[PDB]
């Protein structure tokens, strides 16, 4: 109830500061201070609680600071960080408000409930997902070693405080690395351990609060947290190992663009010099399509520059529109390159979007603060989409569909690329936004999306050796959408794909999904040319694991029990016929049993397995299987 | 010493390093036949726990001579091989990996009769390392082939890093 | 200097029929191959037989002396994976070897042409586990390796370079035997003249460690602790000025009382490099009236030219 009103008051103050009535809203900064003083500076003289009121005042202040941050920068954020640092270094009651400061960008405050120092590393390890945590485990080990060094510095009180001064001055190179490359993952990992170290040590928590109380680093961390959510759909997303080349490309793009990333610490002072420098540099370096990611900082600070004029960039926008209307023979054009920060002046003249935001914030006031930053960007993109659909090639894309004119022509509408097979071979090879096409077939309009899903099936005919992420996106959309009888038949003629085995093994309740799965394994087990044999063995092992893991599901599983009996009869036939694939399936079943083993029930099955291993087998064929079954026998025995 | 740190808890780091040079002179000379001083000392070492990670380089290097010097008696080196195993589960040894592979080769060359005691020493270390075994794959081809070491569990942890399992 | 191709054709005719088609024939040919630079495709992958599973002494010893010199002509993305494969093959035999001499020989071929190739995630852990050692001279450049790779990839080493320095000062003020002090006085002398870039925001480890540890009753302490003072002002200038009205008092025991003889060639150099580096001028030079003529006996008693 107070998150919408504080955001509406901040928007009204920004609209008053942007208009000519700047003197009627300049005296509200103390009104922005007492709300920060009722939870932090309230326990300076006398401690009182009012714990729920302080928790509600800290969350509304955190939402107002993470919504736009046009009021705290840069004369009020340094005073708010110092008051929080003084409250954290005063006592243990006022130092518990840092978790709401940690829940904005590095949120993991509910991992450990102040118990214990040995369980903090386990909570930091369990804070991940953790599917691919190779570098995350080393980062957690480095954070645990840094916390151990901080604990040794706290236990070295007070004649060996050199390590405490090293932990306090541990942001020297980190402040220089974030101003040139904008990478503070290790600093965010080290700052997340300060909440775990504040459980029973007052001096270590005070040293960790004084070490991260830099006014120059807090604004950089806020800018890094605000810029991390802008690369979700604008730039290309990748892993941690591929982010170094993207950071090097975003940090080194031009010669005139390098004099603004490390400099301009007080960016909220005038907010007009950087825009004028960008407008002067865009007129000189034209007709080249360079700096695709360097204009993201100017686009993110476009709506935050409330201290600018009304028609200051009108001539630059007119020059950009005149240059864009005569450079259609370059062979490389992007409508989202620099037009996102130029068309925002036409929809932000005098309280245009502010009233539409305040009406949506006061109509519901339930969840109008999480996806508001994406909705504002979507509205700014759709405000210029009607002019971009009429100024660009709208009737010439079907006659000049080349490799250079197929940049953003794949997602124009729903019936834009429904039969284009030439662009699909390039979209499957590039895969820049391959996962975004499956969301339109799963969000709404399920009756008119299945043919588009057939286009995804065309992708299943296009790239048989797909990646793991594309296979996961194809398996999630086939399981999340109903009427998947057409998608379950794709495994009838699959070579090595098998995209309907893992999707049908999760939840199967139809007769068509059970009548075809009971015969496909028996058809694949007959072809003993090792192509369909390993796939049928993996499918039988996955079916056995799904039947064994479901301890309570289900009540209407009579057909599932009949399919399991028909597969166990086929498994017995494959064990009586074959020896290598049967041993591989037995080793897989033993591994699936030992992954969740809790009793000695596997040792009783050794007497039934020793009689079956000597019934129908060989001596030379089982030598390769005996080197892998020894670990399964050791896991079943012990 | 061993009654003090078991009743206080995990706060005993403020009086720890004032007795390390008192322990450095223990391993230098011992006129007692049988060396009962190190045997009575390791019973207090086995109850350390996970609070001595800042002074490990002053006690773990000087305990190499106990299983290396030929002057040591036979019951003296039997109780110091699992002493590292008592603190391996509590402590972390991501950086300490080179001194438990090379000295144990020439250790096993001297006393082959203590294989049943020293066979559990590397187990708690390779349980702690995990993905730090693929470098030392021919080391078995250097060591065990020379010494005929066979056990049912040994075919598991060699295979687990090959297939890629984690448990 | 007009027919290099004749020597190259003779080398490719003689060595290829010996290496591809017993003990001394490997050494006397691999020392001939690693003598001068060449223009090297199949000869790099020829080393999959010698130093993998050998039990001799001079096979894994000479494995790094040749391949580090054959890769001297180091944008062409053709043989970069070959250089990475050689860099991965050297680490699996430079660490896993039991002999200390071969482990000393695998560090004598490292150059500055591999700074961008050691920034990969599959190559940092090869040197992350090469810290603890019984051999002392291998650990001398162990801080130099993490100091050279400190400014090259700073975005992934910032918790790492601060947790090796906290274990240093824990054994200075808590030592009781001369062996640990003699090892530490040599270990601390390498970082003050190799990597100044990890020192300039880090006054506090080396400030308090060089105050109380200068009053030790073995001439080796005087010879080796003063090696840190020998480069005390190159790494930082006009910073220690407010606390040096007591450092020039205990030097007379290094000068007079000729009973514990120390290396005065490095001691006078240590007392001399501090003047013109951080700007030490007149203000202590009147507090001693007597040592102005003792140097006249220093310049006439000892006959050392250094």
Describe the structure.
The structure is cut from a larger assembly and holds 1 copy of chain A (638 residues) and 2 copies of chain B. Chain A is mainly α. In chain A, 54% of the residues lie in helices and 0% in strands. Chain A is built from 31 helices and no strands. In chain A, α1 packs across α3, α1 runs antiparallel to α17 and α26 runs antiparallel to α27. Chain A is globular. The two termini of chain A are 58 Å apart. With 167 residues, chain B is mainly α. In chain B, 40% of the residues lie in helices and 0% in strands. Chain B contains 9 helices and no strands. Chain B is globular. Chain B starts with a helix and ends with a helix. Chains in contact: A-B, A-C, B-C. Chains B and C meet through α2, α5 and α8 of B and α7 of C. It is classed as gene regulation. The entry lists the keywords Cryo-EM structure human mTORC2, gene regulation. The entry is titled "4.9 Angstrom Cryo-EM structure of human mTOR complex 2". Chain A: Rapamycin-insensitive companion of mTOR. The organism of A is Homo sapiens. Chains B, C are Serine/threonine-protein kinase mTOR.
How many beta-strand elements of chain B? 0
What pattern of helices and strands is seen along the backbone of chain B?
HHHHHHHHH
CA-atom Rg of chain A in angstroms: 31 Å
Kindly, what is the distance between the CA atoms of the first and last residues of chain B, rounded to a whole number of angstroms? Answer: 37 Å
- Total of DSSP H or I helical runs spanning 4+ residues of chain B: 9
Helices of chain A, by number, come to: 31
State the total count of DSSP E strands of chain A.
0
Percent of residues in helices of chain A comes to 40-55%
The biggest beta sheet of chain A is recorded as: none
């Amino acid at each position: 109830a107070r998150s919408r009103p504080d955001l509406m008051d901040n928007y009204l103050a920004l609209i008053l500061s942007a208009f000519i009535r700047n003197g009627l809203l300049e005296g509200l900064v103390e009104v922005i201070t007492n709300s920060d003083d009722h939870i932090s500076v309230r326990a300076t003289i006398l401690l009182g609680e009012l714990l729920h009121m302080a928790n509600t005042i800290l969350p509304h202040s955190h939402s107002h600071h993470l919504h736009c941050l046009p009021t705290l920068m840069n004369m009020a954020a340094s005073f708010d960080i110092p008051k929080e640092k003084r409250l954290r270094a005063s006592a243990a009651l006022n130092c518990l408000k840092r978790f709401h400061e940690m829940k904005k960008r590095g949120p993991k405050p509910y991992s450990l409930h102040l118990d214990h120092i040995i369980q903090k590393a386990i909570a930091t390890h369990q804070k991940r997902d953790q599917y691919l945590r190779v570098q995350k485990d080393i980062f957690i080990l480095k954070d645990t070693e840094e916390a151990l060094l901080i604990n040794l510095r706290d236990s070295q009180v007070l004649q060996h405080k050199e390590n405490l001064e090293w932990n306090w001055n541990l942001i020297g190179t980190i402040l220089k690395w974030p101003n040139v490359n904008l990478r503070n993952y290790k600093d965010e990992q080290l700052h997340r351990f300060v909440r775990r170290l504040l459980y029973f040590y007052k001096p270590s928590s005070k040293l960790y609060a004084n070490l991260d109380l830099d006014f120059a680093k807090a604004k950089q961390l806020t800018v890094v947290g605000c810029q991390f959510t802008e690369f979700l759909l604008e730039s290309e997303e990748d892993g941690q190992g591929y982010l170094e080349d993207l950071v090097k490309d975003i940090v080194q793009w031009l010669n005139a663009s390098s004099g603004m990333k490390p400099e301009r610490s007080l960016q909220n002072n005038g907010l007009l010099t950087t825009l004028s420098q960008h407008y002067f540099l865009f007129i000189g370096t034209l007709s080249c399509h360079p700096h695709g990611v360097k204009m993201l900082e100017k686009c993110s600070v476009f709506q935050c520059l409330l201290n600018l004029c009304s028609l200051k960039n009108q001539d630059h926008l007119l020059k950009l529109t005149v240059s864009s209307l005569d450079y259609s023979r370059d062979g490389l054009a992007r409508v989202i390159l620099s037009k996102i920060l130029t068309a925002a002046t036409d929809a932000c003249r005098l309280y245009a979007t502010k009233h539409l935001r305040v009406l949506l914030r006061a109509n519901v006031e339930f969840f109008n603060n999480w996806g508001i930053e994406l909705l504002v960007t979507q509205l700014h993109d759709k405000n210029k989409t009607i002019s971009s659909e009429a100024l660009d090639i709208l009737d010439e894309a079907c006659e000049d569909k080349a490799n250079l004119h197929a940049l953003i022509q794949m997602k124009p509408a729903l019936s834009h690329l429904g039969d284009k097979g030439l662009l699909l071979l390039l979209r499957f090879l590039s895969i820049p936004k391959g996962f975004s096409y499956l969301n339109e077939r799963g969000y709404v309009a399920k009756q008119l999306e299945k043919w588009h899903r057939e286009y995804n099936s065309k992708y299943v005919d296009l790239i048989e050796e797909q990646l793991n992420e594309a296979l996961t996106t194809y398996r999630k959309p086939v399981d999340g959408d109903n009427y998947v009888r057409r998608s379950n038949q794709r495994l009838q003629r699959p070579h090595v794909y098998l995209p309907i085995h893992l999707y049908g093994q999760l939840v199967h309740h139809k007769t068509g999904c059970h009548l075809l799965e009971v015969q496909n394994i028996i058809t694949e087990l007959c072809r003993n040319v090792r192509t369909p044999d390993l796939d049928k063995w993996e499918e039988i092992k996955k079916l056995k694991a799904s039947l064994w893991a479901l301890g309570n599901i289900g009540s209407s599983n009579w057909g599932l029990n009949l399919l399991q009996e028909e597969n166990v009869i086929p498994d017995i036939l494959k064990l009586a016929k074959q020896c290598e694939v049967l041993s591989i399936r037995g080793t897989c079943v033993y591994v699936l049993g030992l992954i969740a083993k809790t009793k000695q029930g596997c040792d009783i099955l050794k007497c039934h397995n020793w009689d079956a291993v000597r019934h129908s087998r060989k001596h030379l064929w089982p030598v390769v299987p005996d080197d892998v079954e020894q670990l399964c026998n050791e896991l079943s025995s012990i | 010493i061993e009654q003090i740190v078991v009743a206080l808890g995990g706060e005993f780091k403020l009086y720890l390093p004032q007795l390390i040079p008192h322990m450095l002179r223990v391993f230098m000379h011992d006129n007692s036949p049988g060396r009962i001083v190190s045997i009575k000392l390791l019973a207090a070492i086995q109850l350390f726990g996970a609070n001595l990670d800042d002074y490990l380089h002053l006690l773990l290097p000087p305990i190499v001579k106990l299983f290396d010097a030929p002057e040591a008696p036979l019951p003296s080196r039997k109780a110091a091989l699992e002493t590292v195993d008592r603190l391996t589960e509590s402590l972390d040894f991501t950086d300490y990996a080179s001194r438990i592979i090379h000295p144990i080769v020439r250790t096993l060359d001297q006393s082959p009769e203590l294989r049943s005691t020293a066979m559990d020493t590397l187990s708690s270390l390779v349980f702690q390392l995990g993905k730090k075994y693929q470098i030392f794959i021919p080391m078995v081809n250097k060591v065990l082939v020379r010494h005929r070491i066979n056990h049912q569990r040994y075919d598991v942890l060699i295979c687990r890093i090959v297939k890629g399992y984690t448990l | 200097p007009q027919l290099k191709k004749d020597i190259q054709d003779g080398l490719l005719k003689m060595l290829s029929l010996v290496l591809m088609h017993d003990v001394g024939s490997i050494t006397l040919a691999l020392r001939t191959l690693g003598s001068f630079e060449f223009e090297l495709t199949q000869f790099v992958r020829h080393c999959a037989d010698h130093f993998l599973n050998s039990e001799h002494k001079e096979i894994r010893m000479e494995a790094a002396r040749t391949c580090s010199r054959l890769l001297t002509p180091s944008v062409s993305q053709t043989a970069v994976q070959v250089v990475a494969d050689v860099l991965s093959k050297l680490l699996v035999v430079g660490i896993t070897d039991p002999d200390p001499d071969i482990r000393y020989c695998v560090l004598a071929s490292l150059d500055e042409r591999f700074d961008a190739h050691l920034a990969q995630a599959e190559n940092l852990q090869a040197l992350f586990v090469a810290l603890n050692d019984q051999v002392f001279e291998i650990r001398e450049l162990a801080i130099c390796t993490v100091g050279r790779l400190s400014s090259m990839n700073p975005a992934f080493v910032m918790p790492f370079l601060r947790k090796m320095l906290i274990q240093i000062l824990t054994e200075l003020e808590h030592s009781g035997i001369g062996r640990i002090k003699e090892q530490s006085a040599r270990m601390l002398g390498h970082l003050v003249s190799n990597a100044p870039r990890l020192i300039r925001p880090y006054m506090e480890p080396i400030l308090k460690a060089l105050i109380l540890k200068l009053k030790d009753p073995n001439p080796g302490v005087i010879n080796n602790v003063l090696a840190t003072i020998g480069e005390l002002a190159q790494v930082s200038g006009l910073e220690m000025r407010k606390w040096v009205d007591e450092l020039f008092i205990i030097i007379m025991d290094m000068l007079q009382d000729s009973s514990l003889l120390a290396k005065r060639q490095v001691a006078l150099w240590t007392l001399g490099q501090l003047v013109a580096s951080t700007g030490y001028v007149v203000e202590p030079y009147r507090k001693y009236p007597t040592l102005l003529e003792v140097l006249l006996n220093f310049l006439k008693t000892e006959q050392n030219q250094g």
